[PDB]
């Protein structure tokens, strides 16, 4: 998957090339965001349950006819509510992949690909995971570099979604 | 392609000598300002499908006429690909402004862009509207002062807008 | 295929392969990228010497004077592919070869080897090479300017799904080439339209525990069996025997005329 | 303008021997490519060098994608 | 040419995609090297002419016979003297670039593609060069990163003529 | 587009071939449901304003929120009502296109492809327009071949939306 | 590609209109004339190669230049030419006539026909006297009354005489 | 492709008749400098990169702005491509001289080449001076007595040399 | 294998629950149908020779191909075994009207047979038409009103002719 150094080592094979210059930068640039990657998933993931209940709840407020109206695809019952608490947690879960990753590429691979017909076929709303990736944005209470990749991810998905 | 630093590489070499210290100082300044750069490049693609749909639905209010029945953005394939090119030309812009020069924008996404579009009876002139608003929702969205270091971004910002202006010059 | 079959089929490399597409104004390294890439792909991974390089046609290409479609017919209808792939090679070796270097995909049905059998006979190497190049397949597949790139392992519109299975019988592995005359593996799964188990990557090996013999290897033994003793249950046959009683099932095997398909270690 | 040495293949024959300049305008998505792997860069005159034998399978390409073949020149 | 930023832009437009987390870290890396690269080009050409000089005489004093066996591709006369001075000076400058530009790419472009052709045609042993550049890594003078690239540089080189 | 008879001369041309007895079947079954089509398309385009008022009025009543919630994508002002009556009009006019064509030729080349691409990027639910095509199958008051036809290509559009 | 419904369907897209009573009722009078198209163009396809080689035939006949040595009907793959773009020019006439719409017979059959001919040194008048006996032969068969439902097929013999001069002015 | 024989073939074909006595004459005639055409020929190939590298040498001593930095023959790449060139232009007069006949040179590798040099910023006068370079070489090369049959080959040298004249025209 | 109560156990126990009341009145429906179905088997079985012999004298007149000499059923040792399958498709019919479930047919007599009939050249086609005839005269046999207590056997009739439909499937 889509990470700094998978693709500089996909880039040069595809070359037929050594690994020169080019790609020790790429790896100092991970370098240099690696660490504040590693510690958004970690401030991520401990207040991981915080973040998918006040996400699932931010959902339920802006659609609440999410709540009342009966059906497979809405969470009026506790198997909806159900079902979205675990939407928001993988999207939360994968989005600390890609903090740990240094990319979008555990989004790609587990959830980005294949989630528009996913999203058509079980008639799930985008604008629901939309308003979740904004609740997640303004409540995981980041700083600096941690922010700015985190955020980074939580709008590529909230792009891929609109 | 080129980046800022390999085009003065190439004139360099095309003149058959060292880069004086005059080009080395200014692509000093260049690598001064590339944090200022990247987090332009950041924030027009996390905000770019609001950028495309926002200007597009501009585009769409004012010039009604592209999408009344006959229209070039009437029916949904239209429509589709007419998306689809202002998110390429948004797209291309922020490859120039990662690269630093114009060259990703001229080869990959304006060269023959006119003849394209004049070939299939785009209305050019309106992708050029389209592409100024584009423009305007980027370049505020780059000056937004909070949750980022203050600085000033005016030289960057001014480079961002001759790239938007050069692709809706290339539409015209 | 996702990640976790893709390490079991060993084809992690096919799967997160890129399409490559010259476009306009393209640099040299680009030109220099796309002339290794269809050497690669259509040359079918050989090492391919710089004396054997199409020198005029690479310098075509670069003055953009043809495409990369061009190009690559002018590389498949080139001596050195018909050296390495047409003259020691039987016809059905040689059209899948043919099916995997410049559509990317494993022969579907028999009437495709009735197909480019009967327009060799007819029109010569030449007509019977255009026919790929110039097929709708290799039009919305790659078009002008994509190289072609295999396309077997994943879901095609208006494929067969034997065709997945059947790919892991052309593609070997990332490691592998097609260099060695030879015979086509799918001949009777071709002729009778079937389709074989895949033994690809680490699909292949089976448990062990202490009933493999001294040296812990299994081989597995496909057959066809038909009665010649014991009753006969199915035509097709697994046989998961030590290295050391592999001589004793291959003769015993042999003396009940069994015929032997394919013989891998397990 | 070159490319003769490698279009016209091995024919040998006078006939095969000559190779043409199409010069297609139009190339839109269409339904007959909807399921194109490849996305179209131009739609504006495009220049296809065609030796003689292949003629008339590239028209019928070009005829089956909506292309229009507004001149033919001699190469 | 191979440089990150191109490089990057190359990748993600290869997919169609917009300029991501991992071409941002590309860009970092870039920036972390550049500086360094920047006073590396200054003191190579600052001390250009020194170096090509020496060089030369270096393949001179290991390779005596060029020095005095006639032929076109020999230094035995003032105008094999003054090829071979270019040819170092060639490299020089090209490796100059390959340091301001962050990668290989204008070694590959101006020199590197069709340097054995040449070699082959006008009957120039590539040992002579490579043991030219030796002499440049050895006696260039820089320390820290803007020696590792440099050095990176030139082993890439001799690493192509051999 | 694609029809009985485009579809007959777009594959005797793939294989070269003249219309064969085949083909001349094609057209006989053309023939035979093609005034049923058209009495089809005319009972709908005579009733059309009802019908898309009835339809925008049944999306509006199962969706309460698009009629209260501010949004450009929402129906809660004239001019979302306007964008809504429009659409459901234009679903209206190519099914009657379709019925008129005897394919789904016109749904697809107008409708169909890229609706996708609309939905996601104006934050449209296809959900609404679900609603709108059962409203038109449970109100448009045809029989025999022409409901048959009709109700085809409604189910067309209702499955290219799930 | 259009057929007779679809052009109609089309030209409606553009206007953004239901086909009107007059439309409908048009495309029922050509459904009610289908049976006479659809045996026309049996007709025409199951004396395809008669019309073809008597075409031909009377061609060389009253244009012995082209097959004398060196004309361009002369040898034998130039000749299996001569009549293979005969029987395409035939073929794709009764594909129009079959869809009702000239579409077909424009966008793949003549579709740079005109410049082919120019580009090889192939004579498109005498191509277009070809087309023009080819006519003829096809409308008398067309029109032979012998062994079919008695009717007036006047309408679809003019339209097949269209598709037919449409070929041959393209090719002059 | 044409060689001596089937030249006038081809004329004779495209006028329908029979190869006269003085036609067949003068082929008897050529197959008489046969062995002298395949020395010419087997000369030129065993000299063939002496003649190139030399050729080459003497036109970067003249013209030095080839080979100065912003020169067509700068970098490694371009000078790589000038000497394929000149190898490319030697190999097709090879052809020429053993077919007896200019079709290949011409069709192959003269026809277009000086638009495409012209559309790259290729000089075609110092091709052409190269062409002359290569013509000088290889006319001694061939007109060297020492180690074979003597005798006249001023016929073969003469026709070397017309091929190698239409090189040099066509591509300046 | 499964029987009729065991299938609806398994999938109760996949899904971790009591038989609801719904799926209790299904089996004990399934128990009153229980002395029929006894019936169904014991005429089968009463009837297996004839119905394998008649059946294949019935395919060997209609398809004469099989017993021509080089035929699949040609020889004696080949057309025991065209005898044995028959009764072998004929047995596990049965064992599946016994048990009210087709895992026994299924599990040990469908699967893998078309792949042997493949692998050995048994045309698979030819089996399924004695499948046809032996099923054809097995339901007969079934329906037959005389000596025996009147009913409707129609539901029973209906899963004989699916397992038979199933084996008819399998083998082509
Ligand atoms: C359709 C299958 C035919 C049919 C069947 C039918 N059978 C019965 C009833 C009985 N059949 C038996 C069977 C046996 N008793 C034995 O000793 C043996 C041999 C070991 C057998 C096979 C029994 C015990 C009964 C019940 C008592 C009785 O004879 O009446 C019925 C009656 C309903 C019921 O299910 O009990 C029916 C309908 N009848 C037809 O008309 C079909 C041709
Ligand atoms: C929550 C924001 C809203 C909501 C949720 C909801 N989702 C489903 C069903 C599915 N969700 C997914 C999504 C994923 N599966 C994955 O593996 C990943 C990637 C790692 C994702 C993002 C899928 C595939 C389904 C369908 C299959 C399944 O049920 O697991 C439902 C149930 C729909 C149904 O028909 O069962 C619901 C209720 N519902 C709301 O109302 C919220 C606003
Ligand atoms: C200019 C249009 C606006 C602006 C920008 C600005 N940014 C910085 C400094 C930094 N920005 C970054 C960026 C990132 N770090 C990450 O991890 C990510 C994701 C990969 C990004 C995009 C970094 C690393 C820095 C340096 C450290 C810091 O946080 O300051 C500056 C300061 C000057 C500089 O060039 O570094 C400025 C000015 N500020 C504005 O007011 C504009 C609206
Ligand atoms: C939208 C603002 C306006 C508009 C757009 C429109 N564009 C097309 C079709 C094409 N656009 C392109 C351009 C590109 N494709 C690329 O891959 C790139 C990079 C090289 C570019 C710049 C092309 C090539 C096409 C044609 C092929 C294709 O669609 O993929 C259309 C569709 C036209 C048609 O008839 O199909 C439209 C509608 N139309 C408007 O009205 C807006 C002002
Ligand atoms: C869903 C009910 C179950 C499931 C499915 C699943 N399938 C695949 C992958 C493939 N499926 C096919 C099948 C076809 N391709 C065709 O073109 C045709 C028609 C001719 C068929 C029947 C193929 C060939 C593949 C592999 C190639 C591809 O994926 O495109 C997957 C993905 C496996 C992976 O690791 O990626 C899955 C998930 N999986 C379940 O668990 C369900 C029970
Ligand atoms: C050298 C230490 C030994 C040796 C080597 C040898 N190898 C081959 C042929 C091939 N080598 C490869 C391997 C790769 N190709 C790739 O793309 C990859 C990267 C993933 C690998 C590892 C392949 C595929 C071949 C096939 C043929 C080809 O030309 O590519 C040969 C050539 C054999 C022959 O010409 O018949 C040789 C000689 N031989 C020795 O004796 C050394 C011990
Ligand atoms: C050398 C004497 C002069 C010179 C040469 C030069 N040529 C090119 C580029 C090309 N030359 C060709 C020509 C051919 N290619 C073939 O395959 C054949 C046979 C059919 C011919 C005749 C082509 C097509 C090109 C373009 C592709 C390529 O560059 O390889 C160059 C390079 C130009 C550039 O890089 O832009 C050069 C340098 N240059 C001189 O100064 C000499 C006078
Ligand atoms: C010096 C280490 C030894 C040596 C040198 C020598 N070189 C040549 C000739 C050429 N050198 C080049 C190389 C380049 N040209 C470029 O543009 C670049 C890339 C930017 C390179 C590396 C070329 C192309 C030539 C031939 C054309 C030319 O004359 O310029 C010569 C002369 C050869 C001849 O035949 O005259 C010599 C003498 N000689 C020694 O003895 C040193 C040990
Ligand atoms: C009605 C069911 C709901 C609704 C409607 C609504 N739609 C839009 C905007 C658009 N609708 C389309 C659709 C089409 N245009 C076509 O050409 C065709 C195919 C022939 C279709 C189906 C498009 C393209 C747009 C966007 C451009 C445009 O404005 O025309 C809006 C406005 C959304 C916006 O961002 O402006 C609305 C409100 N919304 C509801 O709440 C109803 C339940
Ligand atoms: C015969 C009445 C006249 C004649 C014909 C002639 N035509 C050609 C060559 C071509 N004709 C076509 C046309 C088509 N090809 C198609 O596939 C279709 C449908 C899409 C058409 C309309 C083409 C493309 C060619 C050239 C390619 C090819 O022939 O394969 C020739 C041969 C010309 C030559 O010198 O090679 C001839 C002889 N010539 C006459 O004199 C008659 C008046
Ligand atoms: C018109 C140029 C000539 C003509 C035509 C004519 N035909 C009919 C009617 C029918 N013709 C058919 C045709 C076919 N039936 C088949 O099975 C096939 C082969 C697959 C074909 C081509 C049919 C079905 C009919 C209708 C039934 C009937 O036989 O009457 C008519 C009558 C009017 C009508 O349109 O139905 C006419 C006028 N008659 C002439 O005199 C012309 C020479
Ligand atoms: C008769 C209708 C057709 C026919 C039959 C035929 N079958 C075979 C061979 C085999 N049949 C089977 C099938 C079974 N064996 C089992 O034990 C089971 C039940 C558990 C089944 C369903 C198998 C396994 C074989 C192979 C072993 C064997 O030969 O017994 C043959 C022999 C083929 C040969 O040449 O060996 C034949 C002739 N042939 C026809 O032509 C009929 C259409």
Redesign the interface.
């Given at each position: 998957?889509k990470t700094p150094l998978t693709e500089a080592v996909?880039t040069a094979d595809?070359?037929?090339r050594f690994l020169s210059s080019t790609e020790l930068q790429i790896a100092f640039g991970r370098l240099r965001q690696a660490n504040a990657g590693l510690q958004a998933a970690k401030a991520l993931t401990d207040n991981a349950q915080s973040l998918v209940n006040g996400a699932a709840q931010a959902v339920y407020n802006k659609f609440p006819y999410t709540t009342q109206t009966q059906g497979n695809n809405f969470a009026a019952d506790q198997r909806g509510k159900d079902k979205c608490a675990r939407d928001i947690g993988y999207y939360l879960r994968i989005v600390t992949y890609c903090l740990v990753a240094g990319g979008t590429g555990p989004l790609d691979?587990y959830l980005i690909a294949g989630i528009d017909e996913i999203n058509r076929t079980f008639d799930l709303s985008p604008s629901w995971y939309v308003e979740a990736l904004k609740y997640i944005k303004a409540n995981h209470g980041l700083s600096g570099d941690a922010r700015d990749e985190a955020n980074s991810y939580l709008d590529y998905a909230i792009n891929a979604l609109s | 392609?080129f980046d800022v630093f390999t085009r003065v590489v190439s004139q360099a070499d095309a003149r058959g000598e060292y880069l004086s210290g005059s080009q080395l100082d200014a692509l000093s300044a260049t690598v001064a300002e590339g944090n200022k750069r990247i987090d332009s490049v950041n924030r027009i693609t996390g905000n770019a499908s609001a950028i495309v749909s926002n200007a597009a639905r501009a585009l769409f209010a004012e010039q009604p006429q592209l999408i009344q029945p006959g229209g070039n953005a009437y029916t949904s394939r239209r429509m589709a690909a007419c998306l689809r090119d202002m998110e390429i030309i948004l797209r291309y812009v922020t490859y120039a402004t990662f690269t630093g020069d114009a060259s990703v924008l001229?080869?990959?996404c304006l060269?023959?862009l006119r003849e394209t579009y004049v070939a299939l009876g785009v209305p050019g002139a309106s992708v050029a509207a389209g592409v100024q608003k584009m423009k305007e929702a980027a370049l505020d969205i780059v000056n937004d002062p909070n949750g980022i270091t203050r600085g000033d971004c005016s030289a960057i910002v001014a480079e961002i807008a001759g790239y938007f202006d050069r692709a809706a010059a290339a539409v015209a | 295929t996702?990640?976790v079959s893709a390490q079991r089929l060993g084809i992690v490399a096919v799967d997160?392969a890129?399409?490559?597409?010259l476009?306009?104004?393209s640099?040299?390294?680009?030109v220099?990228?796309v002339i290794?890439?269809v050497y690669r792909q259509v040359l079918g991974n050989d090492h391919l010497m710089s004396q054997e390089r199409?020198?005029?046609?690479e310098?075509?290409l670069r003055?953009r004077?043809?495409?990369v479609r061009?190009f690559v017919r002018?590389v498949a209808?080139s001596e050195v592919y018909r050296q390495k792939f047409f003259h020691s090679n039987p016809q059905n070796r040689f059209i899948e070869l043919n099916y995997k270097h410049l559509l990317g995909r494993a022969p579907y049905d028999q009437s495709e080897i009735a197909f480019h059998t009967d327009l060799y006979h007819q029109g010569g190497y030449?007509a019977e090479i255009?026919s790929y190049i110039?097929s709708?397949e290799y039009?919305?597949?790659?078009?002008?300017?994509?190289v072609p790139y295999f396309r077997g392992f994943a879901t095609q519109?208006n494929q067969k799904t034997v065709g997945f299975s059947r790919s892991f019988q052309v593609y070997r592995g990332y490691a592998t080439s097609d260099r060695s005359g030879s015979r086509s593996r799918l001949t009777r799964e071709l002729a009778?339209?079937?389709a074989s188990p895949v033994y690809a990557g680490s699909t292949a090996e089976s448990l062990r525990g202490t009933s493999a013999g001294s040296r812990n290897q299994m081989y597995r033994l496909q057959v066809?069996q038909?009665?010649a003793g014991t009753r006969v249950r199915?035509?097709?046959a697994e046989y998961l025997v030590s290295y050391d009683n592999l001589s004793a099932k291959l003769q015993q095997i042999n003396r009940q005329g069994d015929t032997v398909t394919m013989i891998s270690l397990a | 303008?070159?490319?003769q040495?490698?279009?016209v293949?091995?024919?040998n024959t006078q006939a095969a021997n000559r190779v043409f300049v199409y010069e297609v305008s139009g190339l839109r998505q269409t339904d007959a490519?909807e399921?194109?792997?490849?996305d179209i860069?131009?739609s504006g005159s495009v220049f296809?060098?065609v030796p003689y034998?292949?003629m008339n399978?590239?028209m019928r390409?070009i005829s089956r994608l909506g292309g229009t073949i507004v001149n033919i020149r001699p190469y």
């Open positions: 998957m996909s595809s070359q037929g691979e | 392609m001229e080869d990959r060269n023959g | 996702s990640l997160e890129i399409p490559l597409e476009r306009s104004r640099t040299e390294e680009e220099d990228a290794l890439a199409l020198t005029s046609a310098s075509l003055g004077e043809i495409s061009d002018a209808l030449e255009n110039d709708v039009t919305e597949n790659f078009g002008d300017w994509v519109r009778r339209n079937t066809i038909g009665a199915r035509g097709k | 303008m070159l490319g040495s490698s279009l293949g091995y024919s490519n399921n194109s792997a490849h860069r131009r296809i060098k034998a292949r399978d590239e390409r």
